[model samples]
Target: GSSGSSGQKIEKQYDADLEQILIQWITTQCRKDVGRPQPGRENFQNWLKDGTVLCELINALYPEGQAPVKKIQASTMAFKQMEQISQFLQAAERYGINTTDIFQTVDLWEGKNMACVQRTLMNLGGLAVARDDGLFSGDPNWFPKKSKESGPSSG
Candidate 1:
């Protein structure tokens, strides 16, 4: 993906093993309804190829107040990538997702696209999910906000 501000292009290699794990994770969730389009290996392949699943997963993992910035865009923050990974690991720990399991996913992905792997694991752990096209469509305050009176005084 190219940086929105700069013309810099960030290139990352693909890991088939990591990709397979993501597909398996998405497919593991089965719908009880008979006619619904179930997420399958083929569906996962297309989603990854088109980046829909990746975008959705990212939105899910970092929604509203939890996101690193006020607005989300498809730009590489360079150093902030590591910070994002740490935040994911911290969230995983809070949600009881094994650190070793997280590490395994990172290892499989060669730490290239950690966000995708992290978000997939987050979904596996039963966090929220956003529609592929609705990632940036919410109120931006889906989570409750602290009242101004409740905050520390700044006088």
Candidate 2:
């Protein structure tokens, strides 16, 4: 939700809770009446890509000695990107999304401005390898082929 001078706060109403994503599968609750429940793989991928975009925005906005006077543009862009990730994260568990796979972008966003991450986040590209986290930890083959069960594990 937004808490700012604009006085516009956004709220989300989810059909399901998302807390269990890191711990369990959410696909068990199938409703015969609703046809197949659309798997969240695509949403997860989109969120991942948005993370990458957010990273790029942050890097461009926060270069050393930048005026940051274009506060409105920055704020709007920040709000849109941040909301995308925030909403996705909120619903991630409900869809059994692997947030660990989201690390690449999250890490990169964090690298842009660790302090402001929680304060002002954006949807950008992949996470930064230079920061903490294992998947892109200086490995040329950061993305490896493995069983779905063997994808990036959050550490």
Candidate 3:
């Protein structure tokens, strides 16, 4: 339930220059399937054009106790949109993502790019899950050790 840093020091806000670093990393490192946001071509953006992506993101960030019953209810779509942005911000804080860099994705020169929005959300989601799954625990054998150890009642 903790949302603090896993490292020895608290993660600090990234410098302005770090935005470019993140943009470059995400553009270069992420798999094409997850990084690219195609429109009307069965890609992430196509699926999210109707705003269901926000609903899904909200559901993921909150606990089962806090999630909406009908996640994509049309009546609450507007509120969900704001919640989606907040979720992204919280993820940025947890994962050291830069807000300016995040805004760049959706505020493209042509117009708002749903593909970039989708890509950003996916990137943030990766960070969120990686933290929750303890992927950065730095103990390669952690999972195996847990699996080998029996429960307290095993005796």
Candidate 4:
């Protein structure tokens, strides 16, 4: 199932298909009977608003118990929830994702653009494929390494 990586152009309006991939892949990291996101942007963002899933996911990617984000929990107060989002953001950088590749904290916390959030998850998955580190735990086909390709020379 872990076979996906592409350098081809992706639509700016893309949402559902990417969400499908990200959700399935996410369910892998935050294992042990956790629930999943439903189809559509509202449900998607709401499911991730608390940061519980992302926190658990980043921790799982580590060796032993070297999880970066500590004390993850669902919070009702806006800032408290956003605090978790920020922690996940920082941890993702520590986990090796570049600043540009990841989404903004408000991008998710503020519900500005859900697609960007989806982009960040896929970005992490792609890098994991590239690293080939034992840290990856999903299906091999879950994310194909986006192998670099040089186009034909104009000559």
Candidate 5:
């Protein structure tokens, strides 16, 4: 039962510490009900799947009371959920994340490569702190800027 036959072997690059930083940032930046960070990736997906956390996150980075996200409400509709995620996606781009670095809409919603999502958030946090916008809530070094901007995927 040797399972290493395929040529596409790649180690999982997920980072729990980075995930906690982002989760903690969201909890402090927005709310306390963003689910505890104990459940790992599942909680990361659940807390961010609906885009509620993401939407408020980008919005929170803006000047207080003048967030780009005009509306912030949860819904059970699948499309609505996607819509919120889409909104966050666009905002992430607007917030300076390279469009190429952004994750697919289905990526976060369907629990695909969460490492990709974390990468996007990392870029966002880096840009936010780099801008010194006076809005990022975490310790400045928590999301340090990289010397080179990398893609979300692709070799």
Candidate 6:
């Protein structure tokens, strides 16, 4: 978040300049988390437009215990296209999951044309959003119906 005082009127130029700064921050952070420099400033900047970067950011803040590592991983891949990333995250929310590795996935999916990536990602988004299975737990009511709904035993 910007730290300028309340009285300071932010100039549009400042916004543009800060945008690069912010992108650098995101790339540095995301790349570090994913254990690589796969996502650079430009790639993250595009991811920021549709709220992908922001969402991953929020998820990243969660304590490791609660963080959705799988969801984040999926998101990293999804964010490359912009459109699909939105749908993918939406689905993750629907399923009540998050992941820390999403930043890496973003790097995996990154490409040149924002518009083309946007279009292809949207198609992926359709698959993401249309899921009938309990993949995403965005709905407040989304939860395990029974204790038996178990995977490999943690204990």
Q: Candidate 5 has what TM-score?
A: 0.80
Q: Write candidate 2's Cα lDDT for 85-146 as tens digits.
A: 44434433233334543333343233442322321221111222222323222122232223
Where model 3 places Cα greater than 4 Å from the true spot, the runs are: 1-43, 66-71, 75-96, 103-111, 133-155
Name the lDDT value of residue 47 in candidate 3. Answer: 35
On residues 37-94, what C-alpha lDDT tens digit does candidate 1 reach at each position?
3344334433333322333343354555763333323334444333434443455555
Candidate 1 vs candidate 3: the lDDT winner is: 3
User: How do the predictions measure up, each by TM-score?
Assistant: 0.32, 0.21, 0.36, 0.79, 0.80, 0.29
The true-structure Cα RMSD of candidate 2 reads: 19.7
C-alpha RMSD for every candidate: 16.2, 19.7, 14.2, 8.9, 5.0, 15.2
Q: Per-residue alpha-carbon lDDT of model 6 for 1-155, expressed as tens digits?
A: 55567536533211333334434443343423432223444554345544445445434434455544334333344334455445345544444343331232343245333333222322222333344543322221222232223368657
Cα-lDDT of candidate 5:
0.76
Ranking, TM-score, top scorer first? 5, 4, 3, 1, 6, 2
Q: Comparing candidate 3 with candidate 6, which one achieves the higher TM-score?
A: 3
Name the runs in model 1 displaced over 4 angstroms: 1-73, 104-155
Candidate 4: lDDT over CA atoms? 0.75
Comparing 4 with 6 on lDDT, the higher-scoring candidate is 4
lDDT of 3 by residue, 53-89 (tens): 4445444444556544233433345445444444434
Instruction: Give the runs in model 2 whose Cα sits over 4 Å from its true position.
Output: 1-76, 98-105, 108-155
